[PDB]
Amino acid sequence: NMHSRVDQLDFWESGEWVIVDAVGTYNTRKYECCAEIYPDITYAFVIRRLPLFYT
Amino acid sequence: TDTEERLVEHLLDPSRYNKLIRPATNGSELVTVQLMVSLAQLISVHEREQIMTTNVWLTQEWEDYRLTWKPEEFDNMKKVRLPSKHIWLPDVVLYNNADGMYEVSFYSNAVVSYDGSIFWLPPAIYKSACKIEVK
Amino acid sequence: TDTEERLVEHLLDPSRYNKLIRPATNGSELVTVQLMVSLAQLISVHEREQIMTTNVWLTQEWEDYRLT
Amino acid sequence: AHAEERLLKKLFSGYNKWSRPVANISDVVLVRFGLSIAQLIDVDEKNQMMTTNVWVKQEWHDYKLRWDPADYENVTSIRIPSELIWRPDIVLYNNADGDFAVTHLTKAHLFHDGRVQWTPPAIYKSSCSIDVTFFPFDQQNCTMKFGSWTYDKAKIDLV
Numbered sequence: 001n002m003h004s005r006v007d008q009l010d011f012w013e014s015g016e017w018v019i020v021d022a023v024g025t026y027n028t029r030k031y032e033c034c035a036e037i038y039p040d041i042t043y044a045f046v047i048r049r050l051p052l053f054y055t
Numbered sequence: 056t057d058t059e060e061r062l063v064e065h066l067l068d069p070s071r072y073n074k075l076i077r078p079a080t081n082g083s084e085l086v087t088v089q090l091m092v093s094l095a096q097l098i099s100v101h102e103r104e105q106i107m108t109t110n111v112w113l114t115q116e117w118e119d120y121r122l123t124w125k126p127e128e129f130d131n132m133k134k135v136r137l138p139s140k141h142i143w144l145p146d147v148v149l150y151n152n153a154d155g156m157y158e159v160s161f162y163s164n165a166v167v168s169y170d171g172s173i174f175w176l177p178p179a180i181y182k183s184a185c186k187i188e189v190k
Numbered sequence: 191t192d193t194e195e196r197l198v199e200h201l202l203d204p205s206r207y208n209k210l211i212r213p214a215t216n217g218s219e220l221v222t223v224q225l226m227v228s229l230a231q232l233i234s235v236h237e238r239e240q241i242m243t244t245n246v247w248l249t250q251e252w253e254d255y256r257l258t
Numbered sequence: 259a260h261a262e263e264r265l266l267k268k269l270f271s272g273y274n275k276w277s278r279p280v281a282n283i284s285d286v287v288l289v290r291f292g293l294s295i296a297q298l299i300d301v302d303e304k305n306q307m308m309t310t311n312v313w314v315k316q317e318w319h320d321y322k323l324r325w326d327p328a329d330y331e332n333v334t335s336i337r338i339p340s341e342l343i344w345r346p347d348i349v350l351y352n353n354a355d356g357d358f359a360v361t362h363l364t365k366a367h368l369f370h371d372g373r374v375q376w377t378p379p380a381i382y383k384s385s386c387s388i389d390v391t392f393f394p395f396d397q398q399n400c401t402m403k404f405g406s407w408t409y410d411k412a413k414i415d416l417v
């Protein structure tokens with residue numbers, strides 16, 4: 001993991017959603033296909049909707 | 056002509072011209088790229104998707120000392136057209152594009168002068184994200 | 191197999207087989223190509239846009255004397 | 259087949275596709291441009307675009323691609339990939355949501371006197387101002403602007 005938090009320096013505010021949290025988690029698991037352990041990084045984007053429009 | 060093809064082969068000869076190398080004379084020297092956007096048309100502004108589609112001509116000019124020649128040795132030719140895919144290009148792109156297309160849409164020829172000046176004017180249909188104000 | 195690889199290399203050897211040239215023989219002759227469309231499924235017929243989508247197998251048979 | 263192989267070996271022995279095909283610099287490559295419409299796919303009034311399916315009929319003279327058919331078993335004309343020869347870079351100026359230049363690149367017919375005929379298909383989504391004053395009885399006037407993109411009049415001229 002270069003950095004736990006996902007970089008947002010050049011983010012372009014969509015105007016509909018706001019990123020509450022975005023952290024990549026390093027997971028390792030095995031698949032029934034193959035006999036080796038495969039590592040991965042999963043980024044969980046927690047986005048909160050702005051309700052004014054749909055309200 | 057024979058002279059023109061001889062010149063073109065001489066300029067783009069891969070043994071003496073590598074398009075992956077910046078045409079920088081000195082280590083601290085940097086290439087200056089002039090830019091100018093010619094708005095040929097404003098195709099549309101989608102407020103729902105917050106995208107503006109424009110048809111622009113992106114004039115780009117810079118100096119490539121490796122593409123110089125003496126006109127007197129080449130039948131007094133002052134400028135030749137070289138394909139833009141076979142010369143070093145400053146990869147200028149629309150950074151805030153809203154559809155994942157960064158480059159230009161045609162990649163036309165580049166008009167090269169005998170002193171190394173490149174003049175490239177490719178067209179492009181750009182889709183840039185916009186902040187639409189609805190108040 | 192070694193023999194099959196040798197045959198494939200021999201047939202497509204670019205020094206003797208140019209795919210850009212019609213296999214015309216006996217002079218200014220034409221190559222006869224046999225077509226046969228096998229309809230595998232009629233995926234859809236859109237009436238609004240007037241387009242039919244089909245899944246077909248387009249059989250094509252001709253004679254290339256250079257691949258003998 | 260051997261005659262055409264020999265002809266192809268000869269023609270592209272020293273051909274340079276990046277150079278304008280004029281024996282003399284002062285000459286003009288005369289390109290005989292012309293369209294043949296296949297179907298008017300759609301006229302998007304809301305978006306002010308016109309989709310068409312046309313064949314672009316370009317014809318020009320190349321002085322390097324010449325031969326005498328007597329030597330090559332009377333081979334007056336051959337079909338060669340269009341990517342191996344110099345072609346005019348005609349583009350659709352008033353493009354909108356499409357491609358500026360032809361992208362299909364069919365095979366170009368080449369004759370024994372240097373002539374070349376290239377007729378590739380293309381779907382052009384040009385822009386055209388729509389007048390809906392008398393809708394649905396309206397009559398539209400949508401235009402396509404074709405021209406060379408980098409060779410000025412002194413170098414390439416459209417006929």
Ligand SMILES: *[C@@H]1O[C@H](CO)[C@@H](O)[C@H](O)[C@H]1NC(C)=O
Nearest residue numbers: 056057130281282283284285
């Ligand atoms: C090219 O054309 C110019 C103008 O007609 C003429 O003066 C010149 O001699 C020509 N050169 C050749 C090589 O034909």
Ligand SMILES: *[C@@H]1O[C@H](CO)[C@@H](O)[C@H](O)[C@H]1NC(C)=O
Nearest residue numbers: 386387397398399400401402
């Ligand atoms: C169609 O438009 C062209 C260019 O805008 C114009 O020259 C021509 O007269 C128009 N035709 C009609 C019938 O209005």
Ligand SMILES: CC(=O)OCC[N+](C)(C)C
Nearest residue numbers: 163166175176406407408
């Ligand atoms: C030199 C060059 O690329 O010119 C492009 C613009 N145009 C089509 C108006 C001449």
Ligand SMILES: [Ca+2]
Nearest residue numbers: 300301302303
């Ligand atoms: Ca319509």
